[PDB]
Amino acid sequence: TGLAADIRWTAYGVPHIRAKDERGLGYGIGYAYARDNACLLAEEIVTARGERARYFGSEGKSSAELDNLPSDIFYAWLNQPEALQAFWQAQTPAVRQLLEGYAAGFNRFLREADGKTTSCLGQPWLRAIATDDLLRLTRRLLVEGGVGQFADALVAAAPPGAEK
Amino acid sequence: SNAIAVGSERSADGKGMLLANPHFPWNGAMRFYQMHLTIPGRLDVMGASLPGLPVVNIGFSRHLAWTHTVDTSSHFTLYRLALDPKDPRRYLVDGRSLPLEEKSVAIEVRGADGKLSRVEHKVYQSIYGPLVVWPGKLDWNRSEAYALRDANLENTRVLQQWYSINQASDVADLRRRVEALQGIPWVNTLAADEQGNALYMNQSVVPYLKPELIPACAIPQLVAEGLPALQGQDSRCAWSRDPAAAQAGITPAAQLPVLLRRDFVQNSNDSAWLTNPASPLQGFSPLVSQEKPIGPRARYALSRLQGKQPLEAKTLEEMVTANHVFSADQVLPDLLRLCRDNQGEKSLARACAALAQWDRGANLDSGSGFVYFQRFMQRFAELDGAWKEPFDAQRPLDTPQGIALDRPQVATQVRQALADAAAEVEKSGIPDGARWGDLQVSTRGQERIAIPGGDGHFGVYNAIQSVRKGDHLEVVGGTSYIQLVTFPEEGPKARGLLAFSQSSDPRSPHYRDQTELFSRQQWQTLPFSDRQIDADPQLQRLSIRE
Numbered sequence A: 001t002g003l004a005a006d007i008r009w010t011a012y013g014v015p016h017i018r019a020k021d022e023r024g025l026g027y028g029i030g031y032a033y034a035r036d037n038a039c040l041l042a043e044e045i046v047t048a049r050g051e052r053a054r055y056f057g058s059e060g061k062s063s064a065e066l067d068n069l070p071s072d073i074f075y076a077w078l079n080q081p082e083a084l085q086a087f088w089q090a091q092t093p094a095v096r097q098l099l100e101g102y103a104a105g106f107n108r109f110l111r112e113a114d115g116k117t118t119s120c121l122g123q124p125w126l127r128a129i130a131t132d133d134l135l136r137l138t139r140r141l142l143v144e145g146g147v148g149q150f151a152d153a154l155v156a157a158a159p160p161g162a163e164k
Numbered sequence B: 001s002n003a004i005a006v007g008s009e010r011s012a013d014g015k016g017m018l019l020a021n022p023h024f025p026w027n028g029a030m031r032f033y034q035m036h037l038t039i040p041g042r043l044d045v046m047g048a049s050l051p052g053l054p055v056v057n058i059g060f061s062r063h064l065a066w067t068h069t070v071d072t073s074s075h076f077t078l079y080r081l082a083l084d085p086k087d088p089r090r091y092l093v094d095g096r097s098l099p100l101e102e103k104s105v106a107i108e109v110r111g112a113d114g115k116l117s118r119v120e121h122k123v124y125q126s127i128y129g130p131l132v133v134w135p136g137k138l139d140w141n142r143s144e145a146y147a148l149r150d151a152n153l154e155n156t157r158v159l160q161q162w163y164s165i166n167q168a169s170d171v172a173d174l175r176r177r178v179e180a181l182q183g184i185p186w187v188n189t190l191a192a193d194e195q196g197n198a199l200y201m202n203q204s205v206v207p208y209l210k211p212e213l214i215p216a217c218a219i220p221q222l223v224a225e226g227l228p229a230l231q232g233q234d235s236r237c238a239w240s241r242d243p244a245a246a247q248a249g250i251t252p253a254a255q256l257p258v259l260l261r262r263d264f265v266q267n268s269n270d271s272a273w274l275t276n277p278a279s280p281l282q283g284f285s286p287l288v289s290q291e292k293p294i295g296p297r298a299r300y301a302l303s304r305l306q307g308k309q310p311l312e313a314k315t316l317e318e319m320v321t322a323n324h325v326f327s328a329d330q331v332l333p334d335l336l337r338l339c340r341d342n343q344g345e346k347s348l349a350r351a352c353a354a355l356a357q358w359d360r361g362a363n364l365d366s367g368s369g370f371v372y373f374q375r376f377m378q379r380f381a382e383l384d385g386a387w388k389e390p391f392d393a394q395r396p397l398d399t400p401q402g403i404a405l406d407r408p409q410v411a412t413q414v415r416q417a418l419a420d421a422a423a424e425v426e427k428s429g430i431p432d433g434a435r436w437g438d439l440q441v442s443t444r445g446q447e448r449i450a451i452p453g454g455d456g457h458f459g460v461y462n463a464i465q466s467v468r469k470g471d472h473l474e475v476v477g478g479t480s481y482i483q484l485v486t487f488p489e490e491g492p493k494a495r496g497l498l499a500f501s502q503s504s505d506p507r508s509p510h511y512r513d514q515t516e517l518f519s520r521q522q523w524q525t526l527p528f529s530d531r532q533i534d535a536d537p538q539l540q541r542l543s544i545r546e
């Protein structure tokens, strides 16, 4: 509530969001973005939640080309509840409002979508999102320069057996 | 990624100018999206952003444009652990046996039947972070293991950092805001402002070790292979704590390379070193920046920028749209001499023909010479001592150069390598006469659109990475969001494109409209002012609330 945005689109579906505060601004961003990329975002949130194998089984890959189950194990490890909470608690009011606005506006588009620009309409993984989801996405991006590049290596890390 | 920022001393107008040409994937979690954000009176910025993020990552505002490129700094460190000789699940710190921690995660898996199984998986962790196993290089045996400490795990400042950059007025302000918050994860920042300043910062979140600790804390063999590896059995190899850093264990801003000039700064994913050769950036931690030989994109750009002629908007544009395969400048002259030397080797004739006919470009219309050149180069790079003039710390801009044809065994190896390259190309299903654009494409639904550019590793500033799919090369990353910004007095003038278009959804009116233009290399206005926006005959408008 108290979420409002004015969106203009110029040639090529470029949005121009105007709002009176961070919450309205995020509202317009998430709504404009869902219109163009709802399914991409839903797919990447699934990955970032470690739910690939839940929806798609163990046989496929994420968009970063990791197997679904090693990818899920890595993201579940990365985006544990306590990591998300500490992360949220360190966000400034303005960033928080940005994020709550985004989630709300993304969700609003999902509520109205009839498939005009959304191909995955009806899939079970196309779902309402939450601020934690965007934190999951954020943390996934942060570690792309670090432990992300060792996701396979982390999953494979097991202690020795009896061998000689 | 490329970026050039031009200052008052080099632009044709005495003002700043920025060329943003970042290279990122065409799909997935880093697919750029364009947008313009405004809270009237206190925010007005336009550019591109990443999926899920309510901030602009690369863009401009009334007096500033900024952009990023992937830096060569370390953002994590490996730690080699000494295992307790009695227990490979315990590890030694200062000779004291420490227990590994276990965190289990549980994942649901959809089986053959459509039903869910629960898979439990143990993640082992040390004081540094989780253990990692790269078979054959980073093992976990009875004597050692490796843990990884990623500095961006504790960077909670990333979104506030970009939000703050979105509110920056000019270069000095942008620098202040970045140096205070130190929330940039793992990119360089380059920027220009109206006043005509041009800025380069290697200002990101980098693990800090005091300079005297390095020689003894490094794992020397792993460090020669490019890995930031430290000795994990000694507490004095923990990251150093300095109260000036914005986060415990990261390098303070005063220790990260910055260069503020009025002529130019540039970066193509090399280190800070040759950002502008008239002022080398030297003397940094090896975690930060090292004076290593620059790749062909940087060499190319430096070949265009150095000198004293002034740089026009159009000049920066063409550096991208030329599709010039700069690596050819190093090897094709001699390679062609070798061709002439061997006229009437039945095996080499299609190759040499193709290569003499080639425009040295990765244009849609560029001939098969690019294909022959690429595979030649892949084998050339695996040869020892074949450069006429090897890399030379003293001539970093013009070395290496030429084939050592004068040395008889190199000549045999270069010849064999061109025969192998030719055989690989000829073996594959290339129709005779076919162009680079007939091969490299991006699939849109059931159509295909020819895409210009080529791999950055061959010096094509318009870097396009592709992979084999069926009969074609399918584009997967490179040139993505393009913005070229100047500052007329009326307001920021920006031009560019999003290569792959706004929407990844095939149903969208904006699934391929800009891809079509990218194919034709027809950049467009990026409308920023209310006047420019209202001028657009496609303009549409929705207001929403809840």
Ligand SMILES: N#C[C@@H](c1ccc(F)cc1)c1cccc(C(F)(F)F)n1
Binding pocket: A138, A139, A141, A142, B022, B024, B030, B050, B053, B057, B058, B068, B069, B158, B159, B184, B185, B186, B187
């Ligand atoms: N550095 C960094 C990354 C990033 C990580 C976390 C995040 F929240 C935003 C950006 C990133 C990824 C892709 C592109 C870029 C960009 F810097 F914009 F070019 N940055």
